[PDB]
Amino acid sequence: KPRLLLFSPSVVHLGVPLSVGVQLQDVPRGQVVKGSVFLRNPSRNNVPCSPKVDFTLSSERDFALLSLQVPLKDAKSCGLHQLLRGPEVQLVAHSPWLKDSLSRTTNIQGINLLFSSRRGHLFLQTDQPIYNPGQRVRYRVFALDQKMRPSTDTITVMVENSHGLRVRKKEVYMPSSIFQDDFVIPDISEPGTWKISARFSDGLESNSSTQFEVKKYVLPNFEVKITPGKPYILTVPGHLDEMQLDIQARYIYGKPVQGVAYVRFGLLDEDGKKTFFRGLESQTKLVNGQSHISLSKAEFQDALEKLNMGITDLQGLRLYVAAAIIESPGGEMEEAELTSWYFVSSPFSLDLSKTKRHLVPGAPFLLQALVREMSGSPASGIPVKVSATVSSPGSVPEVQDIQQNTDGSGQVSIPIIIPQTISELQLSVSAGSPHPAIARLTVAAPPSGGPGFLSIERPDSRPPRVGDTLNLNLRAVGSGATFSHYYYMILSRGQIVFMNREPKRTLTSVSVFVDHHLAPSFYFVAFYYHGDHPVANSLRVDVQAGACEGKLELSVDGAKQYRNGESVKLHLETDSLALVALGALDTALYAAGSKSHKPLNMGKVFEAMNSYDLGCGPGGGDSALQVFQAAGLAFSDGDQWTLSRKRLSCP
Amino acid sequence: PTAKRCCQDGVTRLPMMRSCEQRAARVQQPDCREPFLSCCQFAESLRKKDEDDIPVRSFFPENWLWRVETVDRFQILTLWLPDSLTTWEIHGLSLSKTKGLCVATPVQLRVFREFHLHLRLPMSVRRFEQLELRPVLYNYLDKNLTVSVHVSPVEGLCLAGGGGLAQQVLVPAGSARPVAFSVVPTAAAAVSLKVVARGSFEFPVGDAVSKVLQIEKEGAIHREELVYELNPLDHRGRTLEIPGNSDPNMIPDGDFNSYVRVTASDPLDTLGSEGALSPGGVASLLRLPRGCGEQTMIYLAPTLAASRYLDKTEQWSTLPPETKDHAVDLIQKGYMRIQQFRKADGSYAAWLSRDSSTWLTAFVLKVLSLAQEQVGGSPEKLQETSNWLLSQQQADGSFQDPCPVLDRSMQGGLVGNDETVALTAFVTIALHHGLAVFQDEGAEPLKQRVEASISKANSFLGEKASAGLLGAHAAAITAYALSLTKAPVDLLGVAHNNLMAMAQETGDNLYWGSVTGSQSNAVSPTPAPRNPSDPMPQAPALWIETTAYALLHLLLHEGKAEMADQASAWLTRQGSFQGGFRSTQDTVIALDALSAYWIASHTTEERGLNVTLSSTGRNGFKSHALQLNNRQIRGLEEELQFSLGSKINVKVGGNSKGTLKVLRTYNVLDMKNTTCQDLQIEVTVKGHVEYTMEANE
Amino acid sequence: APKVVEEQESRVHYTVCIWRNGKVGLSGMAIADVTLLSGFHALRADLEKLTSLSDRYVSHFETEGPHVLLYFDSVPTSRECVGFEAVQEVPVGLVQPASATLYDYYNPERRCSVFYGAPSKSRLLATLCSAEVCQCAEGKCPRQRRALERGLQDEDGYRMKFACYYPRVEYGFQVKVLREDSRAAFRLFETKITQVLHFTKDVKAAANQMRNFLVRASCRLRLEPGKEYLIMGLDGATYDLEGHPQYLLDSNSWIEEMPSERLCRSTRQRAACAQLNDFLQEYGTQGCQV
Ligand SMILES: *[C@@H]1O[C@H](CO)[C@@H](O[C@@H]2O[C@H](CO)[C@@H](O[C@@H]3O[C@H](CO[C@H]4O[C@H](CO)[C@@H](O)[C@H](O)[C@@H]4O)[C@@H](O)[C@H](O[C@H]4O[C@H](CO)[C@@H](O)[C@H](O)[C@@H]4O)[C@@H]3O)[C@H](O)[C@H]2NC(C)=O)[C@H](O)[C@H]1NC(C)=O
Numbered sequence A: 001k002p003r004l005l006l007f008s009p010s011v012v013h014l015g016v017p018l019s020v021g022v023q024l025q026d027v028p029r030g031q032v033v034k035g036s037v038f039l040r041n042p043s044r045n046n047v048p049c050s051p052k053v054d055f056t057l058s059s060e061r062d063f064a065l066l067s068l069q070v071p072l073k074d075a076k077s078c079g080l081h082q083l084l085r086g087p088e089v090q091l092v093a094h095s096p097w098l099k100d101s102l103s104r105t106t107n108i109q110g111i112n113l114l115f116s117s118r119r120g121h122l123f124l125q126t127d128q129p130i131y132n133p134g135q136r137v138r139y140r141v142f143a144l145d146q147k148m149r150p151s152t153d154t155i156t157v158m159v160e161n162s163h164g165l166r167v168r169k170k171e172v173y174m175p176s177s178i179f180q181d182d183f184v185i186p187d188i189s190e191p192g193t194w195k196i197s198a199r200f201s202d203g204l205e206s207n208s209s210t211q212f213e214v215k216k217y218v219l220p221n222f223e224v225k226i227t228p229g230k231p232y233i234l235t236v237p238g239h240l241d242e243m244q245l246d247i248q249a250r251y252i253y254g255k256p257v258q259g260v261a262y263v264r265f266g267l268l269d270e271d272g273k274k275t276f277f278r279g280l281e282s283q284t285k286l287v288n289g290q291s292h293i294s295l296s297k298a299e300f301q302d303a304l305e306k307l308n309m310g311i312t313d314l315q316g317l318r319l320y321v322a323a324a325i326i327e328s329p330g331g332e333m334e335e336a337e338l339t340s341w342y343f344v345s346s347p348f349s350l351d352l353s354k355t356k357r358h359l360v361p362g363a364p365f366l367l368q369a370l371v372r373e374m375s376g377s378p379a380s381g382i383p384v385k386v387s388a389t390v391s392s393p394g395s396v397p398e399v400q401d402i403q404q405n406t407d408g409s410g411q412v413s414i415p416i417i418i419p420q421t422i423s424e425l426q427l428s429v430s431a432g433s434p435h436p437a438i439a440r441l442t443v444a445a446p447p448s449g450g451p452g453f454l455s456i457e458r459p460d461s462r463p464p465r466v467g468d469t470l471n472l473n474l475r476a477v478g479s480g481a482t483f484s485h486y487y488y489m490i491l492s493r494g495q496i497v498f499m500n501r502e503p504k505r506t507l508t509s510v511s512v513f514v515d516h517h518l519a520p521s522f523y524f525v526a527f528y529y530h531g532d533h534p535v536a537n538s539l540r541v542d543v544q545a546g547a548c549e550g551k552l553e554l555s556v557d558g559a560k561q562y563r564n565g566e567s568v569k570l571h572l573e574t575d576s577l578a579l580v581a582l583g584a585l586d587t588a589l590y591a592a593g594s595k596s597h598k599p600l601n602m603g604k605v606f607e608a609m610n611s612y613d614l615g616c617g618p619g620g621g622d623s624a625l626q627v628f629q630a631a632g633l634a635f636s637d638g639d640q641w642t643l644s645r646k647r648l649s650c651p
Numbered sequence B: 001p002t003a004k005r006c007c008q009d010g011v012t013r014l015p016m017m018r019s020c021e022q023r024a025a026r027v028q029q030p031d032c033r034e035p036f037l038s039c040c041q042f043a044e045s046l047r048k049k050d051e052d053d054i055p056v057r058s059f060f061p062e063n064w065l066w067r068v069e070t071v072d073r074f075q076i077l078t079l080w081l082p083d084s085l086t087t088w089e090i091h092g093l094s095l096s097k098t099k100g101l102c103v104a105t106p107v108q109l110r111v112f113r114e115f116h117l118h119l120r121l122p123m124s125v126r127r128f129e130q131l132e133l134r135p136v137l138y139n140y141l142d143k144n145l146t147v148s149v150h151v152s153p154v155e156g157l158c159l160a161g162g163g164g165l166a167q168q169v170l171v172p173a174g175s176a177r178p179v180a181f182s183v184v185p186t187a188a189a190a191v192s193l194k195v196v197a198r199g200s201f202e203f204p205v206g207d208a209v210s211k212v213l214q215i216e217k218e219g220a221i222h223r224e225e226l227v228y229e230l231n232p233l234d235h236r237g238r239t240l241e242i243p244g245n246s247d248p249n250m251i252p253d254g255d256f257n258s259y260v261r262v263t264a265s266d267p268l269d270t271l272g273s274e275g276a277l278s279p280g281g282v283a284s285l286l287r288l289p290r291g292c293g294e295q296t297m298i299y300l301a302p303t304l305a306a307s308r309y310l311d312k313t314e315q316w317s318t319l320p321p322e323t324k325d326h327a328v329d330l331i332q333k334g335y336m337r338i339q340q341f342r343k344a345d346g347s348y349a350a351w352l353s354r355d356s357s358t359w360l361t362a363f364v365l366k367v368l369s370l371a372q373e374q375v376g377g378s379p380e381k382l383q384e385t386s387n388w389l390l391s392q393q394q395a396d397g398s399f400q401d402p403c404p405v406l407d408r409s410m411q412g413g414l415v416g417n418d419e420t421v422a423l424t425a426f427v428t429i430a431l432h433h434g435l436a437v438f439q440d441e442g443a444e445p446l447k448q449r450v451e452a453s454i455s456k457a458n459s460f461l462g463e464k465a466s467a468g469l470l471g472a473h474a475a476a477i478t479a480y481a482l483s484l485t486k487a488p489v490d491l492l493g494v495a496h497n498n499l500m501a502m503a504q505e506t507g508d509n510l511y512w513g514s515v516t517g518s519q520s521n522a523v524s525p526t527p528a529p530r531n532p533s534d535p536m537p538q539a540p541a542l543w544i545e546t547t548a549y550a551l552l553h554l555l556l557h558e559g560k561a562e563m564a565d566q567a568s569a570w571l572t573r574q575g576s577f578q579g580g581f582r583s584t585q586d587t588v589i590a591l592d593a594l595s596a597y598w599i600a601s602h603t604t605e606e607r608g609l610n611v612t613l614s615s616t617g618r619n620g621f622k623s624h625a626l627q628l629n630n631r632q633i634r635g636l637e638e639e640l641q642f643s644l645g646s647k648i649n650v651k652v653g654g655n656s657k658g659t660l661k662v663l664r665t666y667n668v669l670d671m672k673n674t675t676c677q678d679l680q681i682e683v684t685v686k687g688h689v690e691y692t693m694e695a696n697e
Numbered sequence C: 001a002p003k004v005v006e007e008q009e010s011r012v013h014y015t016v017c018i019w020r021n022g023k024v025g026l027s028g029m030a031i032a033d034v035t036l037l038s039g040f041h042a043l044r045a046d047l048e049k050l051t052s053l054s055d056r057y058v059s060h061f062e063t064e065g066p067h068v069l070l071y072f073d074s075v076p077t078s079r080e081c082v083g084f085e086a087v088q089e090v091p092v093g094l095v096q097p098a099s100a101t102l103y104d105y106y107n108p109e110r111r112c113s114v115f116y117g118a119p120s121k122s123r124l125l126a127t128l129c130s131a132e133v134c135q136c137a138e139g140k141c142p143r144q145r146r147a148l149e150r151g152l153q154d155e156d157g158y159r160m161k162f163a164c165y166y167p168r169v170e171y172g173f174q175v176k177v178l179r180e181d182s183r184a185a186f187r188l189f190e191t192k193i194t195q196v197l198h199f200t201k202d203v204k205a206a207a208n209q210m211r212n213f214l215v216r217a218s219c220r221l222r223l224e225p226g227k228e229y230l231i232m233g234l235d236g237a238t239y240d241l242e243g244h245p246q247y248l249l250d251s252n253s254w255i256e257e258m259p260s261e262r263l264c265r266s267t268r269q270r271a272a273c274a275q276l277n278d279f280l281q282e283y284g285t286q287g288c289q290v
């Protein structure tokens, strides 16, 4: 049956063009249809909330990807906007052809889309992350649009203090797309976390924020550092004997501290909740400003009985060391604390987030694992063994045993061959030869009915870099037969980037050039129609490359000194004219490990521009409507609908 | 609970020697005193011979090169680093119109110099005190270093051998040693001490440290300032002679300067770029510290009072364009400074986490309501503030304050009636300004309640004003409050004529203050013997506050006329030398009063003043001829200095009235006997070990 | 085994007490402005315990330069004391007194200002110097010499040479000392003029009048009470309580004890005592080369 397919992202962003896709299906060879697509309000009477763009599809020119701009004045004109958050808007495609030819109920067909006023990217940073009352705090705000280019729109910036009182408001033009300001933290201020927020003036919902902590002036005579021998303690009953630590203390000007250091041991839990041994404490005279401490198993057992073995076991806890050191000459005591000493099942840990939860009978299934060591880095080079048990009805339950070494970003992608008749896949993964980092998963089979399956085949399992070309194989699977073309489209961030049509071959291959429009991750969605039922599948491709679109490299060159100080040259190298914002920070504040207030890095901005990703899960599922809304699309053909998203966050 | 903090405070040491019984007398809270006392008693005798957060280091040097650079293909920056204590992380991010944003990977930079010199100076030294400098030599190498160290010569300091003497110091490997240089300052100035270290033959290594040492004159500083009335329309005041200083406690060594400043443009001097809208504001002009909550209003209300004058008289053009930026910068600073004091229910406390004050809550409501003129759009928080203020109104119609910020009346017996009326009239003024915050169509119950609260309070003020036992201060606020809120005319009239019946007048001046009965035995019924050749006697802060309220009341009651002219003339000649008045409260109210008068009495015509000053000082005979006018902003720019001990002779002409004031500042050897009458203070230093031995028994 | 020892960073303890002499109920906020002794700085750790503990004494404090400011909610009517600790980073010696002032904040007319100094018999009052810098610091001090004391370079007419040649003198008296009493960083002597020789600014000077002479606390000089001195120098700029000029002893001032009849009649000084009287008569009547 001839029909019109309407595609669009799940949510609408005000001030951001919505890329809507139209596709004409099953029409006679000489047929030509023209129409118009626009947004309209269902909350009031159906007034258009946007301009209307026209389209024309032939049977041999059957698809078009259209940019629908949604401005503020028309959203205000259709009575939609302001304080109330998360309304729903209709995107309708209009043509006489639905009534004139198909004899449907009305001309229009459409889908309900969630409406958000958030737009653009706003980054903001302070000249220091921690302050004392009386200090001057300088901050700057960067403004960019959806396509990650500097924006000239005006912004509204506000500061709120420890108790949430709006204390400074400033609204500025942005001719340079960067804003700089300064203020002085009052000398009588209470200690606590202040917050700076900034949003586009007409955005309302587009706010981003950074925060800093002001607290009392503390500058000690000497710094104290606690360093465990292993930053983790294995909780395996066969090996609990690691715990040992080094103590170190030295002046700001370098002189080692001679005194007596007292370390007291305990246990820490979720969200703090201190508890410690009242009968165990170890003291040592410092030598070379250092000391080396160990904890015996018998002392640990005696302390565990003193605490009556707590709740159950130590797996969820972390070893807690509080250090008090008092210098012998001065007689002044200084304090330190170590709060990162977790009891671990294994130093390595498995993550199976990128593994799809849906099988395709007769097509391979990719187990994709991430192994990260402690809390510091992804583990590169560690073997990962996979045991996959196929459950097939009334037949042999075959098992597949295969291992692979992590490389690059610490990832392993292992193909598992799925037979044409399956009930489920029982999966168990083991990482690391000496210690057992384990994970398990069970993937259920799709129903025996349905219109068929589509396999989007990934031959090169390695994560692409920006500049690589990824090859994807499309093959209809199993029951399906007698169809013409494959239809596919690319989704990156919040919009459809590209949409195309592929004629079938014995092996149908599609090549995607991974440029900077697809960073940091994109979805490949493909589908074909079996009569009046769509068959669809998808996969998410995480681009594993932190490289900039441009480039900024810092390098300190030759130096020279006449002894009032020392001079050195700093080189700023980049590609194309750019505004380079600089800043120099003392490493001492981050060396201790206090707070997660890292400065802006390339991983965070990639995470920030990926906040507009509407997809949920790593790949589509059993039904085509599930596949499309898992990818992040709204879809309607006049016969099947996709329900509007009730929350911007994933379920 | 708070009992944990009270027990922790009980075991914490105190600098003073305090046993637990007298120490627990200060807490004044029963559910805190019981754990505080028991934990103190535990620590007092039974104990012989952290719990929450940890003390992570919080002071870090400011972010140098916090800047943006326009970078093309590449750019080269030269950095200068004195010997770095810690490693720097140099960060950077790029924003380009063509290729988007890029965050650069950081580069580490440290200067770990082999030989490092560390000089430390005292904050300030008085001349002919002796000090032994101990610059510390740091050797970070794995070997010994023998360096030749010397302190550079400089005049005014007694260096050893004039500064050419050098000492050979062996600094061991990986350690530090000081080298002692004794020096005696003989002249009071800011001198630059430069310590130089150079390796003698062994290694060509060196370092140098230069720091400025402040040498001050002996004794303690003393300050006296006096105001002279310049009027050529009166032929008696066309010439006057200013006598020199002859204080018997003055320090002998060193000549001192008497500073004078003359003006014929008092409003621009007071509220212009040289005065209230200086980049430091009136806060910089006042001598007082400004830590407390009330003092923060000196950033806003004088700045607002200056803005209203310049806005409504239309002469922002006569001030530099930096002035408008100064005003909004001061208002933002003051608004941020006070909002830390706001409590959850909308009240304001004198100090952080202290009890609420009805007076301060009213004061903040009054000023921040005026602040909506150019920093508006915040009605909710001011509506909360006034709604809390309504809850402090008693059945009498008056308001109660459990912890008042400002006590001022000295009329015994009636002091409680004065303070209750003064507080009530002050809250009424604040509530009246609160009406202008919300011109909203809705939220009228608050508008109706504050209108009803003002009417009940005005009836209370009317009874006490008609009874006529009030002091001068209470009647001053009451007369303004009744005129401001447009109280019944019968109440308005009795308060006005009761206020005027307490006025004191002399020459061209009208003022209020301390008029319980007949205050002098030689005066005529209304004037007094004072002529322009005599100085204007400086009045206490109470008199300036009362006269400012009376002047504000006169502007609402009549507008211009002689009574406002004579009252404002006295106020403009009570201001301190460098701007502002006695303290914060009298300054803010007087600047509001003078601003309202200056807007009403402004004229576009130009009147001038010619002043010729002359004196014979240490620099000989000097004379200055200045012609001034009403349109000429002036101030600190043209201070004129003469020798303190020599008299100044001035002659004045023109067609306008002006003001001359003189500043005498000098150090003293004794504190005379005109102080330590009402209040007392004694300060002693006992030595650390001697006090430790007295405490440890 | 025994050691002679002097420590770096000497430390002292402060005690500040305030009270209201009046019986009136008026209190109000007041500020104690204590100017520290030279080189010292107050410990912020001890100051915070005064304000931030449950047994609060001081309401708030500010350390600004050598000043320690203490905010008080009210001034008690009974003597109430607050103390803290202060240390000296860079050793300053010969420390001279400093001042402190307690004043009503909103009525600064009400105030009490006092001088306070280092504790006697402590290293703060003592010197610390090499011989050269202490000799350099004494160069400005007055010319203290004994009765009829003559130096190597005195040229047998030295008193007349001092008065009329170099450095030339502007006043000249012969006085008897009554007492000395201390001032802040100074010492002043109450003297009675036995005989007037020459004057310039002090026009109404005459014999048997009182007059005050001041010398710095650092200097060697002190005029002993109950003795007679011939002192002559340059006019100053200060006056005493009753309006008479005060005089400053520096390197341009001549200071000589007057000899007794026993010293004059002794064979050693019979000629020197005659030369002094001959100078006294010529300078007292004729003046400088008339
Ligand atoms: C870099 O700077 C450092 C610090 O100044 C120098 O360190 C010194 O090194 C010497 C050795 O080179 C040490 O010498 C030892 O001195 C002890 C104390 O002696 C004192 O009294 C004698 C006179 O009686 C003085 O000459 C001396 O300077 C001290 O003031 C002696 O007791 C030692 O002798 C004992 O041990 C030796 C071991 O070999 C035996 O043979 C002897 O018989 C005897 O039992 C010894 O002589 C000296 O102590 C170090 N100084 C300090 C403060 O500890 C480095 O020398 C210098 N680098 C260079 C290259 O010079």
Ligand SMILES: *[C@@H]1O[C@H](CO)[C@@H](O[C@@H]2O[C@H](CO)[C@@H](O[C@@H]3O[C@H](CO[C@H]4O[C@H](CO)[C@@H](O)[C@H](O)[C@@H]4O)[C@@H](O)[C@H](O[C@H]4O[C@H](CO)[C@@H](O)[C@H](O)[C@@H]4O)[C@@H]3O)[C@H](O)[C@H]2NC(C)=O)[C@H](O)[C@H]1NC(C)=O
Binding pocket: B672, B673, B674, C241, C242, C243
């Ligand atoms: C507490 O502190 C106060 C202020 O510092 C001190 O007060 C001073 O006291 C002395 C001694 O009584 C005063 O000196 C006397 O002043 C009288 C008033 O003179 C006024 O008028 C003349 C011009 O005619 C001005 O120069 C002067 O400053 C005053 O304004 C004179 O009448 C006195 O003179 C008599 O004695 C002298 C003695 O030499 C005779 O020659 C005269 O002919 C006449 O008989 C005398 O000069 C001084 O004026 C007071 N200061 C002030 C500012 O007034 C207190 O002394 C002090 N308390 C204690 C206990 O010391």
Ligand SMILES: *[C@@H]1O[C@H](CO)[C@@H](O[C@@H]2O[C@H](CO)[C@@H](O[C@@H]3O[C@H](CO)[C@@H](O)[C@H](O)[C@@H]3O)[C@H](O)[C@H]2NC(C)=O)[C@H](O)[C@H]1NC(C)=O
Binding pocket: A207, A208, A209
């Ligand atoms: C952009 O601004 C909005 C608000 O304008 C932020 O949404 C707020 O997020 C917080 C945290 O999840 C929500 O929790 C509540 O916050 C309030 C303070 O706003 C606090 O008092 C509560 O205890 C609770 O923690 C808050 O409800 C929510 N605001 C609304 C209206 O729902 C948003 O987080 C900002 N964007 C970013 C990136 O931070």
Ligand SMILES: *[C@@H]1O[C@H](CO)[C@@H](O[C@@H]2O[C@H](CO)[C@@H](O)[C@H](O)[C@H]2NC(C)=O)[C@H](O)[C@H]1NC(C)=O
Binding pocket: B607, B608, B609, B610, B627, B654, B655
């Ligand atoms: C004193 O100030 C007045 C202005 O207030 C000056 O007035 C001028 O005086 C001269 C004669 O000295 C006249 O020719 C001018 O016409 C006057 N100006 C005006 C505008 O009328 C006066 O010059 C000043 N005195 C001196 C000595 O300069």
Ligand SMILES: *[C@H]1O[C@H](CO)[C@H](O)[C@H](O)[C@H]1NC(C)=O
Binding pocket: B500, B501, B502, B503, B504, B505, B525, B526, B527
């Ligand atoms: C003059 O002073 C007397 C003081 O009793 C009166 O207050 C009188 O009212 C004053 N004159 C004027 C016009 O107020």
